[PDB]
Amino acid sequence: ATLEITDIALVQPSHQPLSNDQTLSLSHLDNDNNLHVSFRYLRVYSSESPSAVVSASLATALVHYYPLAGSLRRSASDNRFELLCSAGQSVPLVNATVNCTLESVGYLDGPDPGFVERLVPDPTREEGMVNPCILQVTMFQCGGWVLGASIHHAICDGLGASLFFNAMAELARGATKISIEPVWDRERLLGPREKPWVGAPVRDFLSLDKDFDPYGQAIGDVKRDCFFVTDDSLDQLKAQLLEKSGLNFTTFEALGAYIWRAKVRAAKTEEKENVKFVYSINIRRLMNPPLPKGYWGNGCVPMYAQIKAGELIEQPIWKTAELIKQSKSNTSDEYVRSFIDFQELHHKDGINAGTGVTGFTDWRYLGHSTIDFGWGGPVTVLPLSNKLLGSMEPCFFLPDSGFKVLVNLRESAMPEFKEAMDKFHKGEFALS
Amino acid sequence: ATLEITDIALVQPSHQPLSNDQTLSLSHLDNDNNLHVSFRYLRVYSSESPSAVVSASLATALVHYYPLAGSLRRSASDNRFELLCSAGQSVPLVNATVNCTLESVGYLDGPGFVERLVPDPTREEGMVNPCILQVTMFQCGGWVLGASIHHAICDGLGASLFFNAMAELARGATKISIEPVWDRERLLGPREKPWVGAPVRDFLSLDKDFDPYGQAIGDVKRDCFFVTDDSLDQLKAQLLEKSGLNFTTFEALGAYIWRAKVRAAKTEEKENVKFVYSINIRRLMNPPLPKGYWGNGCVPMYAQIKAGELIEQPIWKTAELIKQSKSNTSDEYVRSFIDFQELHHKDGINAGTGVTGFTDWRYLGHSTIDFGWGGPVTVLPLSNKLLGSMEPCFFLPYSGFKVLVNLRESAMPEFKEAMDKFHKGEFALS
Ligand SMILES: O=c1ccc2ccc(O)cc2o1
Ligand SMILES: [Ca+2]
Ligand SMILES: [Ca+2]
């Protein structure tokens, strides 16, 4: 089963919004170094044709979201990114065609059949500055298709890319005007204070080292593995944790704790290596003043819980989950402004969180269904980037009743983790 | 506070009535552009779990109420919305929790996590998922039912028939008592020769690129005010001893609020402003609409005046203007309102700027929606886009009563002051 690029149309906006070269600068969250990647993910649709439908809504959306056709480039003074927009810039659209039906591969929900990685362009992050937003429409012989997207993480976070794709989707459904107007103005809203000040909750977590590439660690060839998890086992687990800890845990707390411990123990981490649990959270509604409705840049700070690997692999789950619960306490206006002010002081010092960072990303209850171009919402959605949140092994929560846990793991540790998930799938949680 | 979403159950109909996919046409009342919005409200209950009971009665209801599963699309021949119904479609039921006791949060009267108690889709997103229910549990055994419904599919009394049919099944009804009737393009269709009377022509205008819900007035805040039967009596009686006329609460209080609203917004003296509300016309048509008809069976009634005259003329004149607005409610008024939609849907029908809408929820049987935990103790609307207005106002039921007003940020400081003089009995009636 072989995929085949046919041709690559270069869609400019419908009616040009730019006269001359506007150069937009990016916020101090956009210039995070862990965001100097390209996020690759795809959506699968079942059931006038998808190519022209996507390229039409894209052309019209690019009157408002015109910076997605820009060119990222580093700056003369600071090493920060700035985005170059002009008239004639285009977002490439790849058309592809794989010679099987997608029902034969289970709508790509199960194991990889070989070509999933070619279902969205894979630029190494420097050709991902020239074209920081790339779309692809692969057509299957079934009567069904896939929509891949390679967007540079500095331009937009998850919710920002959601606004853009909801704009394309509604336009394809006959909407007369985009429901929410994009707002840029990122150096105003998310900028550093005049006297930069950083509090303990940020300093206790970040370190400086110009020589540390968080994505360059030699931990081996990393693999992608999905796992189904039922609402039955979660309630089984939340209740046992309740009998012991006297506290009620969210799914993200309790399932995050169990996966963290199973990951660090399977990777045989030294008993006294500092390890970290890291996740993004939206702060748009939390700044004072709150961020505007159409802010589509990065509006998320990373939050952390840290511990020794020895303590993690041996202490009860309900102390680890309690630790993860204590981490979302730090979320505040001062945390974000301290994080921004730390970027202003040490952006060229190589900010990082260290080794043994495991990233967790909850995507279950994004509005995936409303990304509808006329073939229904996506049957399945899949992220491919294993470089995320300063981590090389990021874990995704994805949409007989439960959700899909996607983990990225070093090949050396996948066998024991597959086992630790089967014990979960059997209620043998070994809480201590 | 902390609200978690635990799962989302996609509840399909029990005995799936569709083999063929079915496109259902909506009526010209349904396709009023002022109804292309998602209406969000919640019910709070007190004292075989509410999640399981609601979903079980939801599924059986959807055998007769299957259009609530389908999608809203713009037809090929025109912009007009058609309802795509097919086998396999479902209604999402978000399941959620919060670590409060419901009594801890002053149930839900005293006014901060309510905007999460129900999803908030945009108007286009709302066409993909028109009917979204959400059951949220609180510690001290009690729960909240959230609903986001696209207004093109049904009106107030229409979501009442659907929920009362959910309520009667959850109690143990063997079948549903009233079959729901569609028959929509036949019942509320246009006349072969469209004719539009002056009572409708004087209220609306044509403008392709006017958006009633995208006006640039700033950000709209939401606030409640308790209004006593004490002060209303003193208001109707001082209007009586000054005009000799009798005024209902909806005419006297709605005129005090309309005036204070327009006062606070610093509206230019010669701008036309409007007072709007909907009335059920099911019993007013010749022939009447069936009892099961659950689509939109209401037309907006309007009352208009210059801003400067409204802000300085006596209250009893403004309350008379509203009293006289219900004179226009007839059968031809509805047939004219429909024929106007037939003539000018593509030309952007609207009632212009300055529109303050009002909705009166006090005297509608909110109790009978009983799933097993009694009637809802409180009920709260969350939308602020309604009846072509971005600053709607609600009269909430008897637990005096609470008036819920949506008003732009900059006008709220003087509206609080206005309502504070209403509470003291300083009505300043001219
Ligand atoms: O104005 C209203 C009041 C209640 C209501 C309830 C459901 C609905 O779909 C629309 C509605 O509009
Ligand atoms: Ca440090
Ligand atoms: Ca006066």
Separation in Å, CA A9 to CA A6, A17, A51, A91, A136 = 10, 20, 10, 9, 10
Q: Tell me whether residue A158 is annotated as binding.
A: yes
Residue A190 contacts residue A297 (beta carbons within 8 Å): yes
How far apart are the C-alpha atoms of B301 and B282, rounded to whole Å? 15
3-state secondary structure A146-169: EEEEEEECCCCCHHHHHHHHHHHH
SS3 (DSSP) at A97 = strand
Strand locations in B162-204, DSSP E? Answer: none
Residue labelled with tokens 């996966």: A259
Query: Does residue B430 lie within any of the structural domains?
Result: no
Residues in a beta bridge with B143: B137
For residue A278, give both structure tokens: 């890291």
Say how many C-beta atoms besides its own lie within 10 A of residue A22's C-beta: 16
φ and ψ at B171, to 5 degrees? -80, -25
Helix axis angle for A317-327 and A231-245, nearest 10°, is 100
| Max CA distance (Å), chain A | 65
Q: Is A140 helix (H, G, I), strand (E, B) or coil?
A: strand
The SS3 call for residue A60 is: helix
**Gap from CA of B312 to ligand 3 centroid (Å):** 5
B107 annotated ligand-binding residue:
no
Asked if B280 contacts B300 with a C-beta cutoff of 8 angstroms, the reply is no
Q: Which ranges constitute the DSSP H helices of B188-270?
A: 198-201, 229-243, 249-264
What does A375-387 look like in DSSP terms, one character per residue? S-S-SEEEE----
Residues 6 or more apart whose CB falls under 8 angstroms from that of A63 comprise A13, A14, A15, A16, A17
Query: Which of residues B188, B220, B251 is at a domain's end?
Result: B188
* Amino acid type, A29: L
For A122, residues 6+ apart whose C-beta sits below 8 A from its C-beta are A40, A150
- Whether A85 and A175 map to the same domain: the answer is yes
Same domain, A223 and A274: yes
In contact, A211 and A399? CB cutoff 8 Å: no
Query: In this structure, what CATH number is given to the domain that contains residue B93?
Result: 3.30.559.10
Resolution in A: 2.3
- Take residue A207 and report the two structure tokens written for it: 């370190």
Q: Is the dihedral of CA A204, A206, A209, A213 positive or negative?
A: positive
Give dist(CA A195, CA A210) in Å, integer: 24
Point out the domain boundary residue: A153, A179, A207. A207
A242: enclosing H helix or E strand: helix A231-245
CB-CB under 8 Å, B124 with A170: yes
How far apart (Å, rounded) are the C-alpha atoms in residues B335 and B376? 36
Q: What residues contact residue B393 under an 8 Å CB cut-off, 6+ apart?
A: B254, B257, B261, B356, B357, B358, B359, B403, B404, B405, B406
d(CA A319, CA A312): 9
Which residues are within 8 A (CB) of B353 and not within 5 positions of it... i.e. 6 or more apart? B215, B271
Half-sphere exposure of B300 (CA within 13 A, CB side): 29
B429 inside domain: no
Q: Is residue B47 part of a domain?
A: yes
CB pair distance less than 8 Å for B7 and A401: yes
Stretch (H or E) spanning B419:
helix B412-423
- The whole-angstrom separation of Cα A108 and Cα A118 is 13
Q: For residues A220 and A104, is the Cβ–Cβ distance under 8 A?
A: no
The answer to whether the CB of A335 falls within 8 A of the CB of A201 is yes
Q: State which H helix or E strand residue B156 sits in.
A: helix B156-171
For chain B, the farthest-separated pair of C-alpha atoms sits apart, in whole angstroms, at 66
Residue B262 lies in a domain: yes
Residue type, B334: V
Query: Is-contact A32 A206, C-beta < 8 A?
Result: no
The residues near B206 (Cβ < 8 Å, ≥ 6 apart) are B344, B347, B348, B349, B350
* Partners of B105 in the β-ladder: none
Residue A297, CA distances (Å) to A36, A177, B118 in order: 14, 21, 26
B162 neighbors B134 (Cβ within 8 angstroms)? no
Give me B281's structure tokens.
């016309």
A368 phi, psi to nearest 5 deg: -65, -30
- Based on the domain organization, do A222 and A197 belong to the same domain? no
By the 8 A CB rule, do A391 and A217 touch?
Answer: no
Contact by Cβ (8 Å): A245, A315: no
**Pair B161, B227 in one domain:** no
> Does residue B284 sit in the same domain as residue B314?
yes
DSSP string covering B380-391, please?
A: EE----BTTBSS
B320 three-class SS: helix
CB atoms A251 and B6 under 8 Å: yes
CA distance A426 to A429: 8
Residue B28 beta carbon below 6 angstroms from any ligand 1 atom = no
Based on the structure, what is the number of domains in chain A?
A: 2
Q: Which among A43, A101, A44, A53 has a CA at the least distance from the CA of A374?
A: A53
Cβ-Cβ pairs closer than 8 A, A with B, add up to 43
Q: Same domain, yes or no, for B224 and B316?
A: yes
Give the distance from residue A136's alpha carbon to the nearest chain B alpha carbon, in angstroms: 23
Residues from chain A contacting residue B123 (CB–CB below 8 Å): 179
Cα distances (Å, whole numbers) of residue A126 to A91, A123, A229, A297: 16, 7, 37, 20
Cα(B154) to ligand 1 centroid in Å equals 7
The reply to whether A173 and A287 lie within a common domain is no
The answer on B204 and B161 residing in a single domain is no
Q: What SS3 class is residue A409?
A: strand
- For every residue of B109-149, DSSP letters joined together read T----GGGSS----TTHHHHS-EEEEEEEETTTEEEEEEEE
- Which residue(s) pair with B368 in the sheet? none
- Sign of the C-alpha dihedral computed for residues B55, B145, A366 and B21 taken in this order: positive
Specify the DSSP class assigned to residue B214. -
Whether residues A200 and A245 share a domain: the answer is no
CA distance A352 to chain B (A): 30
- Please check whether residues B206 and B272 belong to one and the same domain: yes
Nearest to residue A418, comparing CAs of A225, A222, A220? A225
A167: alpha, beta or left? (left if phi > 0; alpha if psi -120 to 50): alpha
Contact indicator for A229, A403 with CB cutoff of 8 Å: yes
Q: How far is the CA of A343 from the centre of ligand 2 (A)?
A: 13
Matching residue, tokens 């992050």: A125
Q: Which of B32, B43, B133, B151 to mutate to test the pocket of ligand 1 (most atoms within 8 A of CB)?
A: B151
Contact (Cβ atoms closer than 8 angstroms) between residue A392 and residue A37 = no
Residue A349 neighbours by CB distance under 10 Å: 12
Instruction: Tell me how far apart the terminal alpha carbons of chain A are, to the nearest angstrom.
Output: 46
Phi-psi region of B67 (alpha: psi -120 to 50; beta: other; left: phi over 0): alpha
Residue type, B255: A
> Do residue B128 and residue A401 have CB atoms under 8 angstroms apart?
no
Place of tokens 């336009």: A171
Closest CA to A348 of A126, A154, A25, A80: A80
Name the residue range of residue A349's domain.
212-432
Determine if residue A304 is labeled as part of a ligand binding site: no
For residue B20, the 8-state DSSP code is S
A365 labeled binding residue: yes
Cβ pair A369:B129 closer than 8 A: yes
Burial (CB count <10 Å: 0-12, 13-18, 19+), residue B221: middle
Contacts 24+ apart (CB under 8 A), A51-54: A51/A93, A51/A95, A51/A137, A51/A139, A53/A172, A53/A373, A53/A374, A54/A93, A54/A135, A54/A137, A54/A147, A54/A168, A54/A172, A54/A373
Q: Work out the end-to-end distance of chain B between its first and last CA atoms, rounded to an integer number of angstroms.
A: 45
**How many helices and strands, by DSSP H and E, does chain B display?**
11, 17
Q: Is the CB of B154 under 6 A from ligand 1?
A: yes
Q: Is B19 exposed, middle or buried (0-12, 13-18, 19+ CB in 10 A)?
A: exposed
Whose atoms come closest to the Cα of B278: which ligand?
Answer: 1
Q: Does residue B370 lie in a domain region?
A: yes
For the record, the structure tokens of B85 come out as 């119904």
Structure tokens belonging to residue B105: 């949060």
Cis-peptide into A13, omega within 30 deg: no
Do B84 and B216 sit in the same domain of this protein? no
A365–B74 C-beta distance less than 8 A: no
Report the SS3 class of residue B367.
Answer: coil
Cα–Cα dist A294/A167, whole Å: 11
Nearest CA to ligand 1 atom 2: B156
Q: Is the peptide bond before A289 cis (omega within 30 degrees of 0)?
A: yes
Evaluate the CA torsion angle A415, A417, A423, A428 in order and state its sign: positive
Same domain, B115 and B234: no
Instruction: Search chain B and give the residue with CA nearest A402.
Output: B7
Give the domain-ending residue among A182, A207, A232.
Answer: A207
B46 in a structural domain = yes
Q: In degrees to the nearest 10, what's the CA dihedral of A218, A219, A220, A226?
A: -140
Instruction: Provide the token pair at A175.
Output: 């909407």
What contacts B159, CB < 8 A, 6 or more positions away? B147, B149, B294
